[PDB]
Design a protein around this ligand. Structure first.
Ligand SMILES: CC(=O)N[C@H]1[C@H]([C@H](O)[C@H](O)CO)O[C@@](O[C@@H]2[C@@H](O)[C@H](O)O[C@H](CO)[C@@H]2O)(C(=O)O)C[C@@H]1O
Ligand SMILES: [Cl-]
Ligand SMILES: [Cl-]
Ligand SMILES: [Cl-]
Ligand SMILES: [Cl-]
Ligand SMILES: [Cl-]
Lengths: 274, 280, 280, 276, 272
């Protein structure tokens, strides 16, 4: 796909807006029986015996949407090119709440321990699904069958081996389904993703402060070193993210991970391609 | 709503000054018996049983003022009019030095015979400058929280705007959970955040810091200026000759001897520079 | 006060050097009995009953000096005069290296048989350069605090300036609670902060860090310069040929064996570059 | 070598990609007997009596590869060399560290989640036209490292360390020419050499210090020096080196093992004329 | 001394390389030397006075480098840039020192962490030092032997030495002899030196250090002039305390690392 000139003319620029709700394990608000924990995992707890058999509710997964863009070609073609994005984690202020009814206290008579600890923040803008690389802390982990999360065993069609604690070139997938690819199993593949831009960070520790910023004045430019943004194949724009904001500390000692939604406003332009 | 050229002339630039005192829950210094806790919450505690029924005094809220600006147009019926355009702001959290006090009479000690635990832990800092009220998005930690009813003197929360009880979706982004920041000390911080899908005509800047005893780390200087112009060189345009200024500055917990903890906020000062702009 | 052109000619630039020793509460090294605690407070403790009646030795205060500058105008009744304009400063906290000492005889050991807990915790750092005294705003953690009443002109607190008791509004920003930083070691840091609504003719820069054992993290280099010019390229103009220099540098607690804790301060050095400026 | 002009022409620029798996002590995934701990050390403990006699599985080492480049010269004292000009590099598998439910993970408190991988971090990478020059320096010169096996100061000196090896001993030098063989706690990059390499690193100590890492495919490191010259690949070999210790796995018993992650590289190179 | 033009010529630039080993208290590896690059155990006594031993007083490292001789108007070497690096940073991943205090039962050793102090200086003459101490009642060993404030004053310290006493001044002219806890760079002098430093206090505060051979520090002042080497001597000074070694008993010792320098100098015309 050879990249030609930017299309000149009236309706050459467009804007795409959307938000993605977090897929922490309880992924739907519409199941009365368990939806009270929507945007959280269940309780995360080392079993103390082998092997680990994590349940789907304890496996935060990436959020993804494919956005359909205005059709460009009737019959060398025009493609939408993503050039910038404004993105924001929404609901940050909710985390000042230190009086959840079942919050573990910092000490006797004190306030709740605020949401804190492990953070994981990433977003990606691309013209096709984000490429994923599989790597796990423990290859002996027995993830649930797709029946359900997509894990390394799913893509290999056989059990993990010790090499899956490192980089196994065969352990690859595409982020093509919302709330189905666990964060603990899949990371962005730096060996591919030529047609995506991704940005991420992690923070470990149990009670490490959650420190986050928000402003409507911040823009990320999506152009590469040659001045070309992601090109949207088949008029589809892929947007991916994850925003783990820390643990909810419960009175019993039990802890669950929590996530927040993310907002996007992407600017695109028409580009001639060969 | 076409933006035209900047107005040229002698009195084309004006400077507006204000301060906003914090609205942490005890929101008035003038109450008969309870005002000693002005700029603080009451004691924040998990109930231990469901549901949470938090009191007003435990719900820090946004500060907001509308500033009336000099009237610009002798004829309001014209297509082309002059509007005040906010171009920069100098803003400072006031009273930062007060937080070196480690000898509050009822302060929990760091250890036996030691000084008090200094104000520390949860921080939340934000300010916004707009030509109209700041747009808010509702999202809460726990949808089952029973906030005091607005009709009973309570704050404005999600149930208020929906006309019905929250559902689990309000733990995520619900597009119906929206409001405008149009009342000082009535929109709880733990319920409302700036709405990034709107606010075309505002600029906002904010941060959070969680943890229980996390150091409060703040700077102050009269040399720092925030430029309010967007990518096109246009600042917020003041509709009806009104400038909207919003903020929140939670600076941490006061740790009391018994173990009880209350949040504390500080005031914020603003000096906004505005210029006259022709608009169609 | 119309600012004209920078003066041209041979000796149009001058340099002013000084240092300011900290005023932590024990403010003199020349007292027979108590001067061992020079650069420290006494022991800081919550009283445990109301009200707090803090002693002067527990109230770190701002340092300040007024430097007399060379006289410039033979005839002071002329409309157009030369004034010294402060354009840049090199400033440094002195004695930072002294804080590696973890073997002070009465230092609390971190754990059994260990090294002393080093000077750490609450930090407060600020400096200002101005052509007049720094403008101060009063705000306190607790309005019920009973600060010392003296006959010797210090410490000056909100009650001192108001001529009446504080009220709850003094936990926020009370526009009547204002003062000028015109006396060395007399204005308590926990009561007074720089007033961002004034200070047009000064530049100030500060920060706080709370927490009990938070690392003290400081830099020093003789290569760092602060430019004092505002947006128009004008520095503070020295009224009456006087340069005002103010600062505070609390660097943390000395943790004593008994559990007691005292705040500690370090001195600050300044080298200010000034130029002659025509003003009308 | 005197550096002449950048070669002009159609195929004067090439790209090289590769990944390096971590060599934390259990260095192979292909030994059914012990490979379950691949990318970790064994349990790290003070012996409690002198001397320390660490096992190889407790000595994280540098990763290294020599990448063979296309042959440039059919020959003359004037020739072409590959010049590395930029690199995109990324630590892979960062997301794996959100796992706080490893079956034998020490809990933060009763009934809580596992203590996340945290504590000691050491991160470095190097790109060079020859092996990275190493300087030896150890915490304790009386440490008895396993005989070569890992290469340590005793190996290169052909005699026992002395106290001077707790500081900089100019005799304690090596070249990073073998994957997984040079212990990190013994060897660091030698700033007195490495004219033909570029290296970047950091350390973080503490026991439970947050592991804080970033990843983006938009970040490029420029490898040109102050004269606009990148590393020049002697004998058409490109040397890539790294280490990425990401913290401790805290086990239920109290035991602790260090953990590492792999690193990816995409290096851009151009043809450069050189003399001698 | 009037600074004239930069000398233009074939051999007008030179590079000076050196390293300085740390002087933490046990300052020689050629003796007790098992503790080279460390202090002895640092421990508040609990009773007065404090009479610290010389092995518990980390001191600045310094070298005078003799430069190639060049000569009212003469040439001087002018230091224009430096690449400097703390050596041996990787050694600090060792959490299995045989006598290391454990983080908890069955755990690894507490890594080297806590108090850090990092500084370097490049000058055309000795670094100017200012004396200031935590406690004027500290009784430092007599010079026979570190140089301290009592050494320079010729009389005991008074309370004023907890602040800035303009009489408490010295020149950093001897390696391993000027205690870090007594002396700091004098910002009121040092016109012909450039210095850079930081401190981090705390007991177990993470040691966070960087290393790269791509980082350069420009030594030129605001007028484009670097330090000028009087009598053809370049002064290089540093200190790099990297934290505590935590021992099983509870005792703690400070530890330092060496520092490497590569200084670029050029010839400069000057007038005396
Ligand atoms: C928001 C507020 O005023 N909080 C008080 C708190 C309340 O008065 C509460 O309703 C009563 O506990 O009381 C605090 O002080 C306590 C005393 O009132 C009580 O008699 O004895 C307690 C210790 O045994 C304690 O001193 C509290 O609970 O900490 C103070 C707090 O500001
Ligand atoms: Cl993160
Ligand atoms: Cl914050
Ligand atoms: Cl500070
Ligand atoms: Cl690191
Ligand atoms: Cl430091």
């Amino acid at each position: 796909v050879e990249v030609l000139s930017v299309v000149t003319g009236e309706d050459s620029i467009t804007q795409i807006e959307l938000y993605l709700n977090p897929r922490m394990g309880v992924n739907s608000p519409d199941l009365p029986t368990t939806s009270n924990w929507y945007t959280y995992t269940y309780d995360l707890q080392p079993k103390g015996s082998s092997p680990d058999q994590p349940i789907k509710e304890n496996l935060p997964a990436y959020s993804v949407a494919r956005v359909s863009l205005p059709m460009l070609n009737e019959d060398t073609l025009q493609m939408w090119e993503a050039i910038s994005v404004k993105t924001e984690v929404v609901g940050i202020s909710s985390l000042i709440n230190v009086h959840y009814w079942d919050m573990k206290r910092v000490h006797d008579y004190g306030a709740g321990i605020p949401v804190s600890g492990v953070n994981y923040h990433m977003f990606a803008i691309g013209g096709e699904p984000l490429d994923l690389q599989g790597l796990v802390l423990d290859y002996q982990t027995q993830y649930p069958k797709t029946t359900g999360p997509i894990t390394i065993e799913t893509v290999l069609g056989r059990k993990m081996t010790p090499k899956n604690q490192g980089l196994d070139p065969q352990a690859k997938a595409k982020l093509d389904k919302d709330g189905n690819y666990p964060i603990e199993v899949w990371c962005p593949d730096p060996s591919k993703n030529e047609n995506s831009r991704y940005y991420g960070s992690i923070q470990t520790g149990s009670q490490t402060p959650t420190v986050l910023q928000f402003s409507n004045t911040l823009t990320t430019v999506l152009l590469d070193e040659n001045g070309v943004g992601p090109l949207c194949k088949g008029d589809g724009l892929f947007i991916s993210c994850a925003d783990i904001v820390g643990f909810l500390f419960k009175t019993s000692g039990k802890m669950a991970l929590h996530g927040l939604p993310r907002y996007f406003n992407v600017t695109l332009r028409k580009r001639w391609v060969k």
